[model samples]
Target chain A: KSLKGSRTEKNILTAFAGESQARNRYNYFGGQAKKDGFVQISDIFAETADQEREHAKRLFKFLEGGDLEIVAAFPAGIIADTHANLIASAAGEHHEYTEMYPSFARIAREEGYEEIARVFASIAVAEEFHEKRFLDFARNIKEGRVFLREQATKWRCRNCGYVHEGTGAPELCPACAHPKAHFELLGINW
Target chain B: KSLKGSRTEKNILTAFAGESQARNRYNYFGGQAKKDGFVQISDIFAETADQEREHAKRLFKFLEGGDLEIVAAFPAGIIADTHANLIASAAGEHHEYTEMYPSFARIAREEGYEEIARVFASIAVAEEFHEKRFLDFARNIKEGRVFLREQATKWRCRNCGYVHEGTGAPELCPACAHPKAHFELLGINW
Candidate 1:
């Protein structure tokens, strides 16, 4: 059967389409961020846009079993001003967290696909965090405090989703009781 | 030594930056193409953009081996009016064909990197073809002949760079003589 034959397959295809477009759209937005001189936020969008592709790539494997011809048509990601771009990204993340992913996760659970359900649920959490991060960046932009005076190294706590901006990873993650090694090297100053 | 230490490496990194940006830029343009109702040209942009990514990914492997941190900063690819976008794309393709890729190929040859040299040469040829195709499309757009009234079937010659538009694949490629099998199904109705 084709993707249309199964509702779960259809949902996965739709998610794949959306995520794929999001990856490109975010990259376009990231380029706008760079041009606008919000260097740190630019890297944030690029890094997270890459993660969106990872999400899509994993979903693509499920469709490899069949020749699924899915058409992913998206609106042209017009480059808005950086502030407008941030607001748009923040809104998109909010939609994904509150509406799209939740519905997808529900369908996955109903279809007896625990793995898909878990993935979608985790991604919803991640999307919520992204929404918050973009909103913070947008707020900073509004206040004209977008760029940092000195470039900062970034560390991420693997156990918890806490991100730290400093010269190096802390001896212990403030959000999670993980050691320095547990905090991954996230970004180097550009 | 970093990327800057080797001229060839620097060239490679620059190519990587340009190609990566081109990939996303083309996708954005493709979205605009679809919005403008030029479905065949839309798919062409999307497919070629994927090819651009393949080139970047291969170049990325060279950087990966050296732990090279190349910063690819690009201007946000602002989508202009569809005709303007086509004209810009044609100019970009001309630049790659006549200048950028040829220079890169020369450096690769001088450095005795035959593979890199060949890649650049081949890509330059492909870019020239793309320039011609886009020019054709741009002309069509200018004359208000953007969409086909009756949907036409399209076939692509696998042996050479020939695209045929009609009800089906021709018995032989007009550009390069080959059997019907040489012409693969490229697209259908929008």
Candidate 2:
């Protein structure tokens, strides 16, 4: 039976919260850390704030069509599952950076598009960073609880209720071919 | 007589400083806020850090030849200035977003680069928010008579003698332009 409209899909759509959700997330987290007496961690907010801005810029090209290929091939909504959504987004980024873009590079060589290949390679590495970061955030959440500004902690998978430790792309669920973005974050502690 | 190096140059080579400085300023500021018992302000940091990361991504792309046309026109040093280089990188970003990129977008649309125009417009708006964050921090510092961390503030424009206020870029400067990357922090009173 095909799993349609699962909770995972719901979270991915909702995780963004807003266009500026990433920036909001950092601020909320930073504020909480300070209030909770974790003064050392407050910098995380400012640092991440800068990063979110930077992320907005990276996305600018996509919004502008400067990097048409990447945007076109990897539409933003692929991983609709919230827990799985971030994980899916991370995976797609990896695939594009590592697998797809490299393949594009090979094609560029044959086609003599040297400049495009170089650009793609540089962007590819960044995609790697993006994937790593998501996994990192996921892992942190798994290891310990963090206060989020909005939304509940991701639901845990039931049969395999393992929450992701890092923001890395979710591997396929052994119980199902569903990727990490596809799993629901079950509430009960396993 | 030429106003700065490469009178013909359009981009201020120090443009990169805005991104870096914004990052550092927020880092120090947010760290302080955490210590000051503010929790909700995390919203600010989250937004800014993500923005910084995204900005780096764009800047890196531009550095890595995302804009071949600009790359061909400008020398490599166009974006080499680090965070250590600018007096008020955050203010600089404010200027770029509010004053500079808007102009660029106008030119791009006039030149029939609808896509490029759109891209600049969005980034420019985001920069506006970036400046506000810095200004907020600056206000807090001024009122407290000490920085959030209680360290003696150390900020001077790398290029000019103008001390950084919480907001705004210099009207004009010779040292930063002619010699390149001569930044230091400005005192609030100055």
Candidate 3:
């Protein structure tokens, strides 16, 4: 039957749809972060969004023939202020890496789509990396240490990699002339 | 001033946001169309969605250093049944082609960003083509000739290019064994 192993096809389509949505949600959040003057955070969101688009492209590639019906619900990331949007972005990625893609990979494997399964599994790892970064960024912002840390540290300008030695980031980057908001504290976990 | 020529960068970010949203909306529509058994329309939506993603990427490329503050609202396409979604898609593309991208292009040009203006102008043309296609699709579906024409016509299965001569498409694609729903009327503006 042409319908043999259709489950994998369906899962691929669902994955494609989910990835597409994630791409948009992150771009939306990126704009918000930029508007709030967190240009560095905005760049993070923009980069992550494009990666999601790539994931969608790869997922769409595995679809075989036509007669496909891909219908699935997704976690709708709301358009909110920048701080909350960071949390939403982190949560969305957490779901994908920890749950969605992992399950999809298993289904793809059981359905004999080896290459597709590996792609799903690998992208899940990438999403986990994204989640950790977002999580760290969100935590730092919430803790009011985006520029200052508990100890004196080197703050690196994400825009130009200009380093500043201070308890808090400089008022603006001397080398790149960027606002201190562009700086990330360098020593640990930032 | 760092804010010099900020208008062009702002326009780029707005355009990026719009294209990103369009990509998601089209992908969402594609899933609904697929669920409703319009596999060909679903494919069209998927293709268009990826094109929008490419547009977003190009728009984003024009942004130089960060310090960006991009904020804009968009026409949100809602989730609905396939036919209504087609109408919404046509409307969205029509707006972009006729109004949105043209004005953005003009602003970019006036702000001395020639390449970005060209991209906006070019994508507007692409959107016009998409509008025409969606308009034709929505009209044909409304007029009940997705399978039948006023006169006897060739109905070709979009899946496998199998042609049939009749007032209506065959119950199934003989060459590809797909349901008649996969067939597109062959003779006229379809």
- For TM-score, the strongest prediction is 3
lDDT of 1 by residue, B31-150 (tens): 987776555567667866875676566566666355444554555667987678878888887887799889988987887777777667756755665677678878866865443223
Total clashes for model 2: 72
Per-residue CA lDDT of candidate 3, range B1-190, in tens?
1324567777778777887888899999999887887766786788778767766766676677767676777875488987888888888888887887898889878877676677677677667667766777777778876666777766655543345778888777543346877766542100
Candidate 2 lDDT, tens digit per residue, B163-187? Answer: 3333332332221221212222332
lDDT of each: 0.66, 0.40, 0.72
* Runs with alpha carbons beyond 4 Å of true place in candidate 3: A1-190, B1-5, B187-190
Query: Per-residue alpha-carbon lDDT of model 1 for A136-176, expressed as tens digits?
Result: 87886687543321346555443332456775556754433
Model 1 chain A weakest lDDT span, ten residues long = A181-190
Q: Which of the two candidates, 2 or 3, achieves a greater lDDT against the reference?
A: 3
- Give i-RMS (Å) per prediction: 23.6, 20.8, 21.0
- lDDT against true structure, model 3: 0.72
Candidate 2 per-residue lDDT, tens place, A1-190, comes to 1113333222112222221454555555556544543322344344444544443343342221221111122243331322343454456556656775576556655555565445445445544554664555445445543322144343322222223323332354322223444333322100
Ranking by lDDT: 3, 1, 2
Q: What tier of docking accuracy does candidate 1 attain?
A: incorrect
Give the per-residue lDDT of model 3 (tens digit) for A1-190: 2324568778778877887888888898999888887777887788778767766766666666676666777865478877788788888888887888899889878877777777777677667667776887788778887777777766655543345677888886553345777766542100
If you score just chain A, what TM-score does every candidate get?
0.71, 0.39, 0.87
